[PDB]
Protein backbone atom coordinates (compact mmCIF):
# COMPACT_ATOMS: atom_id res chain seq x y z
CA UNK A 1 0.00 0.00 0.00
CA UNK A 2 1.06 3.92 0.04
CA UNK A 3 2.05 5.67 2.80
CA UNK A 4 -1.13 7.06 3.63
CA UNK A 5 -3.34 4.40 2.16
CA UNK A 6 -6.42 4.67 0.43
CA UNK A 7 -8.45 7.64 1.31
CA UNK A 8 -12.11 8.21 1.30
CA UNK A 9 -13.36 11.17 -1.46
CA UNK A 10 -15.24 13.68 0.17
CA UNK A 11 -18.14 13.35 -2.37
CA UNK A 12 -18.55 9.77 -0.77
CA UNK A 13 -18.69 11.08 2.90
CA UNK A 14 -21.24 14.00 1.37
CA UNK A 15 -23.69 11.35 -0.19
CA UNK A 16 -23.59 9.67 3.05
CA UNK A 17 -24.83 12.14 5.18
CA UNK A 18 -26.82 13.13 2.63
CA UNK A 19 -29.00 9.40 2.49
CA UNK A 20 -28.63 9.14 6.37
CA UNK A 21 -29.93 12.41 7.20
CA UNK A 22 -31.67 13.75 4.44
CA UNK A 23 -32.78 10.56 3.01
CA UNK A 24 -31.96 11.91 -0.42
CA UNK A 25 -30.96 8.54 -1.60
CA UNK A 26 -32.27 5.57 -1.20
CA UNK A 27 -28.66 3.33 -1.60
CA UNK A 28 -25.02 4.21 -2.36
CA UNK A 29 -22.50 2.03 -4.47
CA UNK A 30 -19.02 2.94 -3.34
CA UNK A 31 -16.09 1.58 -5.34
CA UNK A 32 -12.33 2.08 -5.69
CA UNK A 33 -11.51 4.77 -8.19
CA UNK A 34 -9.00 3.22 -11.10
CA UNK A 35 -5.68 4.05 -9.77
CA UNK A 36 -6.41 2.60 -6.64
CA UNK A 37 -5.88 5.25 -3.79
CA UNK A 38 -9.77 6.44 -3.09
CA UNK A 39 -13.21 5.24 -2.57
CA UNK A 40 -15.23 7.24 -4.67
CA UNK A 41 -19.14 6.92 -5.63
CA UNK A 42 -19.99 4.80 -8.01
CA UNK A 43 -23.65 5.35 -8.65
CA UNK A 44 -26.65 6.70 -6.27
CA UNK A 45 -29.88 5.74 -6.32
CA UNK A 46 -33.74 6.69 -5.17
CA UNK A 47 -35.26 3.59 -6.33
CA UNK A 48 -37.57 1.84 -3.31
CA UNK A 49 -37.52 -1.85 -4.87
CA UNK A 50 -35.22 -3.76 -3.47
CA UNK A 51 -34.84 -5.80 -6.71
CA UNK A 52 -33.77 -2.47 -8.46
CA UNK A 53 -30.44 -2.58 -5.84
CA UNK A 54 -29.66 -6.46 -6.06
CA UNK A 55 -30.26 -6.53 -10.24
CA UNK A 56 -27.55 -3.12 -9.80
CA UNK A 57 -24.61 -5.62 -7.98
CA UNK A 58 -22.08 -6.81 -10.31
CA UNK A 59 -21.83 -10.68 -10.68
CA UNK A 60 -17.97 -10.72 -10.95
CA UNK A 61 -16.72 -7.83 -9.25
CA UNK A 62 -16.79 -6.32 -6.07
CA UNK A 63 -18.22 -2.83 -4.71
CA UNK A 64 -19.37 -1.47 -0.93
CA UNK A 65 -22.58 -0.34 -0.45
CA UNK A 66 -25.18 1.92 2.03
CA UNK A 67 -28.57 0.76 2.33
CA UNK A 68 -31.52 2.58 4.10
CA UNK A 69 -33.22 -0.72 5.26
CA UNK A 70 -36.85 0.05 5.43
CA UNK A 71 -39.64 -1.78 6.77
CA UNK A 72 -42.50 -2.07 9.23
CA UNK A 73 -38.18 1.44 10.68
CA UNK A 74 -35.25 2.82 8.87
CA UNK A 75 -31.91 0.96 9.38
CA UNK A 76 -28.45 2.27 7.51
CA UNK A 77 -26.74 -0.92 6.40
CA UNK A 78 -23.07 -1.70 5.41
CA UNK A 79 -22.42 -4.33 2.51
CA UNK A 80 -19.78 -5.45 1.52
CA UNK A 81 -20.35 -6.86 -1.86
CA UNK A 82 -17.34 -9.63 -2.60
CA UNK A 83 -18.97 -12.03 -5.02
CA UNK A 84 -16.84 -15.76 -5.21
CA UNK A 85 -16.53 -15.35 -9.28
CA UNK A 86 -14.66 -11.84 -8.91
CA UNK A 87 -11.00 -11.91 -9.52
CA UNK A 88 -8.86 -12.74 -6.42
CA UNK A 89 -6.68 -9.15 -7.33
CA UNK A 90 -10.01 -7.37 -6.50
CA UNK A 91 -10.95 -8.93 -3.79
CA UNK A 92 -8.06 -8.44 -1.76
CA UNK A 93 -8.03 -4.98 -2.89
CA UNK A 94 -11.80 -4.19 -1.48
CA UNK A 95 -11.06 -6.40 1.53
CA UNK A 96 -7.98 -4.06 2.47
CA UNK A 97 -9.80 -1.15 1.98
CA UNK A 98 -12.50 -1.51 3.21
CA UNK A 99 -11.87 -0.39 6.78
CA UNK A 100 -11.07 3.13 5.53
CA UNK A 101 -14.25 3.64 4.00
CA UNK A 102 -15.86 1.55 6.71
CA UNK A 103 -14.58 3.36 9.75
CA UNK A 104 -15.55 6.56 8.16
CA UNK A 105 -19.17 5.97 8.45
CA UNK A 106 -20.77 7.02 12.05
CA UNK A 107 -23.94 5.60 12.15
CA UNK A 108 -24.39 2.01 10.44
CA UNK A 109 -26.74 -0.41 12.55
CA UNK A 110 -26.03 -3.50 10.13
CA UNK A 111 -22.73 -4.68 8.15
CA UNK A 112 -23.87 -7.56 5.40
CA UNK A 113 -20.68 -9.50 4.11
CA UNK A 114 -22.09 -10.93 0.68
CA UNK A 115 -20.33 -13.21 -1.36
CA UNK A 116 -24.25 -14.48 -3.32
CA UNK A 117 -27.22 -13.39 -4.02
CA UNK A 118 -28.48 -15.56 -1.14
CA UNK A 119 -26.35 -13.02 1.56
CA UNK A 120 -28.03 -9.95 0.48
CA UNK A 121 -31.71 -11.37 0.38
CA UNK A 122 -34.07 -8.92 1.67
CA UNK A 123 -35.17 -11.62 3.70
CA UNK A 124 -31.35 -12.19 4.84
CA UNK A 125 -30.94 -8.28 5.57
CA UNK A 126 -34.22 -8.40 7.34
CA UNK A 127 -33.50 -11.06 9.76
CA UNK A 128 -29.88 -9.39 10.27
CA UNK A 129 -31.06 -5.81 11.02
CA UNK A 130 -33.96 -6.82 13.14
CA UNK A 131 -32.17 -9.26 15.60
CA UNK A 132 -29.13 -6.58 15.84
Request: glycine share 6%.
Amino acid sequence: GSRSGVAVADESLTAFNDLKLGKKYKFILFGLNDAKTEIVVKETSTDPSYDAFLEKLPENDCLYAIYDFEYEESKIVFFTWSPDTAPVRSKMVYASSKDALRRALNGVSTDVQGTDFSEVSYDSVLERVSRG
